[PDB]
Amino acid sequence: AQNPNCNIMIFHPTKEEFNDFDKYIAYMESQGAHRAGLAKIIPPKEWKARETYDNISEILIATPLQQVASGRAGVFTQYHKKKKAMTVGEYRHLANSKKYQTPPHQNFEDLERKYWKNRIYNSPIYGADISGSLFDENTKQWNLGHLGTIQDLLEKECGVVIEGVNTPYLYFGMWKTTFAWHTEDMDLYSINYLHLGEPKTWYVVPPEHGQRLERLARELFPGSSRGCGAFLRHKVALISPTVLKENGIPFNRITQEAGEFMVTFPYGYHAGFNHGFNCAEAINFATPRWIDYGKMASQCSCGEARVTFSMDAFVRILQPERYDLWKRGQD
């Protein structure tokens, strides 16, 4: 069995290996990458996502989200308070202001310490989930706006044609902006490209150990657990590395820098934070190996998780018994 300790693997494809996305994902899996839940892909030196980032300031962040925490430093939830619209240029200035900027630090490990110690005492503003793409249309390799769609994968594997579309999302981050512990909708893969700016630190639980994380989360968030049998679908709970180590939960960590891709694998729980002003682009995708994970994926039916139009068909076809209850939660 490849990668039996479930370590995060880092890949350096050549330009020739960067041509066929599906084939490279399947290669990574042949080497055991999925066992970690997360892999890093460093693009060949010849590749670029686009020529420059000099003209992105007029992108609108229609609903910036202020991430307000409740709890203790290592075990907290966050809610998102909607703020007034602002442009990327306005948001970049805000991120760099004395109130929000990254503090002085020695290295990524010192910053990580400062994040865990101090996150809860601040409410950073995240420009998340913005439909769009920063890949140049002429970038033919690993262009997240040109991937094969999940609807087409389900059709190729299962023969059923379904409605829905699959497009990318931009994330504009600042120091302390946080992504809570989650797997993807329907336990899909995700791919995330860090276009510019400061790094993003990731934490991940191997898929084979995801239920250990879920059991801890039910213990640590006991009211939330009573409210919903899949409350980590709400994407609000944070648990620190220190707490995970104290409770024997297997995980790994890695820092993504600008110009690098990360891939999350089906049922790989992940969480993390941004080091300073940055912009990432991400999208979900599927492969044949996902289908069995989609069929088994938990679902939130309490009403909180509320998701895209396109998840309807996935539930309806892969999880027909759950469909009725899940759709009640959507409506």
Ligand SMILES: O=C(O)CNC(=O)C(=O)O
């Ligand atoms: O970058 C973020 O805020 C969160 N991204 C992801 O969870 C992802 O790409 O799967």
Ligand SMILES: [Mg+2]
């Ligand atoms: Mg612009």
Ligand code: NI
């Ligand atoms: Ni994710």
Ligand SMILES: [Zn+2]
């Ligand atoms: Zn729920």
